[PDB]
Design an enzyme around this catalytic site. Structure first.
Site, mmCIF file in Angstrom:
data_model
loop_
_atom_site.group_PDB
_atom_site.id
_atom_site.type_symbol
_atom_site.label_atom_id
_atom_site.label_comp_id
_atom_site.label_asym_id
_atom_site.label_seq_id
_atom_site.Cartn_x
_atom_site.Cartn_y
_atom_site.Cartn_z
ATOM 1 N N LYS A 6 0.833 -1.212 0.000
ATOM 2 C CA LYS A 6 0.000 0.000 0.000
ATOM 3 C C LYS A 6 0.878 1.278 0.000
ATOM 4 O O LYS A 6 0.442 2.318 -0.507
ATOM 5 C CB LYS A 6 -0.962 -0.035 1.203
ATOM 6 C CG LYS A 6 -1.970 1.111 1.265
ATOM 7 C CD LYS A 6 -3.047 0.837 2.310
ATOM 8 C CE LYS A 6 -3.980 2.002 2.455
ATOM 9 N NZ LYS A 6 -5.053 1.694 3.444
ATOM 10 N N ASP B 194 -7.383 8.004 13.401
ATOM 11 C CA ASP B 194 -7.054 6.678 12.919
ATOM 12 C C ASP B 194 -5.605 6.280 13.218
ATOM 13 O O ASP B 194 -4.693 6.630 12.462
ATOM 14 C CB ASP B 194 -7.337 6.632 11.408
ATOM 15 C CG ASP B 194 -7.294 5.250 10.804
ATOM 16 O OD1 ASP B 194 -6.744 4.332 11.453
ATOM 17 O OD2 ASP B 194 -7.813 5.081 9.683
#
Ligand SMILES: Nc1ncnc2c1nc(Cl)n2[C@@H]1O[C@H](CO)[C@@H](O)[C@H]1O
Length: 385
Positions: free
Chosen positions: A71, A199
């Protein structure tokens, strides 16, 4: 049947999660080992390709051929300084194919090279098969999430990973938007609703500020640290226990790769226990030179060990607020995402920063993104008919 069904996939940096919305509820789907999240790992061995838990479980034995962090590469050019900096910290080879990075490995005794989207497609194929085993039929329609800061090239390469994986990509949606949907924050009627998403995952920290105006989402600010997460906290525990072993036995274990990895996995486990108990016990048989390591640590000591790192999570919160041109009292909702947000000290620091405010944390924070993606995938497949 299958054509009227859609899944939501959180394709995370370190872990991935899949959900399905049916019969009025989201079901976060457990994999074949009973885990609700699956490591974003792909291992290439002398006989097979492993994905998820089995791939993460043999990382120590096969580090050159165990791919993770795809990613961080997806949608980027080889020459990108992010790629060049990250490459120095990976045990796997990254090669250049016409300014496009490829991860190069040994598989079944042969040299093979894969585009980041091919690696991510293997993770996606696993999530697709996990959903299919749960449902009892193949599901191919999916919503896949991405960080709010992903550009068009990163979004397109993520969609390409979905296509390679045999998924019909209904939409690529932002991770903090999926988290806000999970809490139904887009269904509060009229008027602009300001939402902050905090997050803190296994390897990255993202702060996002969104404005929800009559169902329409707008990203006001993104901030954070791409190299801060749960594994830095595991590493702080490791250094403590390495120093404690040295004090008790007058032996340095830091060079014994096996001793350090067994201590690291035990530290990660103890860290999780510390989120619901005020102490955790380590029980390592024959850690180094036949010496057992049976010890414990308080939540107070763990909080001291990570104090500077926990406190550092507030600078991107303040930065996002200034970029969004909003004061604290102008934020309507605070949402927790990422397993690391379960840490009581982290919740306390964020709540105190927002002057004693309640936090949205009832949905498993490592599952909130897949939860929202699953809700959106259901709305989107229903509109398609
Ligand atoms: N109970 C917990 N207390 C603290 N950290 C936790 C917890 N659960 C997870 Cl997952 N993590 C961490 O979250 C990351 C994945 O999102 C990993 O670093 C994992 O250790």
């Amino acid at each position: 049947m299958a054509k009227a069904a859609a899944i939501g996939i959180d394709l995370g940096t370190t872990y991935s999660c899949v959900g399905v919305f049916q019969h009025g509820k989201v079901e976060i789907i457990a994999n074949d080992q009973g885990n609700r999240t699956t490591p974003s790992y792909v291992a290439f061995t002398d006989t097979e390709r492993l994905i998820g838990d089995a791939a993460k479980n043999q990382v120590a034995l096969n580090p050159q051929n165990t791919v993770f962090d795809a990613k961080r590469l997806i949608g980027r050019k080889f020459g990108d300084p992010v790629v060049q900096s990250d490459m120095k910290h990976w045990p796997f080879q990254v090669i250049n194919d016409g300014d496009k990075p490829k991860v190069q490995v040994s598989y079944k005794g042969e040299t093979k090279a894969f585009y980041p989207e091919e690696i991510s497609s293997m993770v996606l194929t696993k999530m697709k098969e996990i959903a299919e085993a749960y449902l009892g039929y193949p599901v191919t329609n999916a919503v896949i999430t991405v960080p709010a800061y992903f550009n068009d090239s990163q979004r397109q390469a993520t969609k390409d990973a979905g296509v390679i994986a045999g998924l019909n990509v209904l939409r690529i949606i932002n991770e903090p938007t999926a988290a806000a949907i999970a809490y139904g924050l887009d269904r509060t009627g009229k008027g602009e609703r300001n939402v902050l998403i905090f997050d803190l995952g296994g390897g990255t920290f993202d702060v996002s500020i969104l404005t929800i105006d009559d169902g329409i989402f707008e990203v006001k600010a993104t901030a954070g640290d791409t190299h801060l997460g749960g594994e830095d906290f595991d590493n702080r525990l490791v250094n403590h226990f390495v120093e404690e072993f040295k004090r008790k036995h007058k032996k340095d274990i830091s060079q014994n790769k096996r001793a350090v990895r067994r201590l690291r996995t035990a530290c990660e486990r103890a860290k999780r226990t510390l989120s619901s108990s005020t102490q955790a016990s380590l029980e390592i048989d024959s850690l180094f030179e036949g010496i057992d390591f049976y010890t414990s640590i308080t939540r107070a000591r763990f909080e001291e060990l990570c104090s500077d790192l926990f406190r550092s999570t507030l600078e991107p919160v303040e930065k996002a607020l200034r970029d969004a041109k909003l004061d604290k009292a102008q934020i309507h909702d605070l949402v927790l995402v990422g397993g690391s947000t379960r840490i009581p000290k982290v919740q306390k620091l964020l709540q105190d920063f927002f002057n004693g405010r309640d936090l949205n944390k009832s949905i498993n924070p490592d599952e909130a993104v897949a939860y929202g993606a699953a809700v959106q995938a259901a709305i989107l497949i229903k509109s398609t008919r």
